[PDB]
């Protein structure tokens, strides 16, 4: 699969859910998984969003530190869903705070992390098709 396309379509959906139109089965499964995750952890996401205080000064370090901590001792599909939802949080905060150019940066950072850090794990664990299979019983 093309990880950049996965990132771009995911972010476009997170932003469209906030009323923002960003000029950029796997997609739909990831879409529902991320929504289920942030609905399940609504209070936690609300607290994260209120402490982000996102600025162009802090965005790169925020992203790198959260993601490094998230995968500190390894990878699983839940942590990958969390990675996408956290990227979505940063993008929504970007447009909310009239910092919409940061969305382009965040999408680049997410694509670079998926391609150059998570790729070997995704490949060794059956690829995105394995994720579709695992989450399939939770769809609809």
């Amino acid at each position: 699969y093309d990880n950049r396309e996965i990132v771009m379509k995911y972010i476009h959906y997170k932003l469209s859910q906030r009323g923002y139109e960003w000029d950029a089965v796997v997609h739909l499964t990831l879409r529902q998984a991320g929504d289920d995750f942030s609905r399940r952890y609504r209070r936690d996401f609300a607290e994260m969003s209120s402490q982000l205080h996102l600025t162009p000064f802090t965005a790169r370090g925020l992203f790198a530190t959260v993601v490094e901590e998230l995968f500190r001792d390894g990878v699983n599909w839940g942590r990958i869903v969390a990675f996408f939802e956290f990227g979505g949080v940063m993008c929504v905060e970007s447009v909310n705070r009239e910092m919409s150019p940061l969305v382009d940066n965040i999408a680049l950072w997410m694509t670079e992390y998926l391609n150059r850090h998570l790729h070997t794990w995704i490949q060794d664990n059956g690829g995105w098709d394995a994720f579709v299979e695992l989450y399939g019983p939770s769809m609809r």
């Binding site: 995750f37 952890y41 982000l52 993601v67 998230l70 839940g78 942590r79 969390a82 939770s138």
Partner: peptide, 21 residues
Amino acid sequence: WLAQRLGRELRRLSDEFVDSF
């Protein structure tokens, strides 16, 4: 330290979530 805290909580939640599949 905000980002370190966010990442740790996201990790915990993630591991709970994947157990729910």
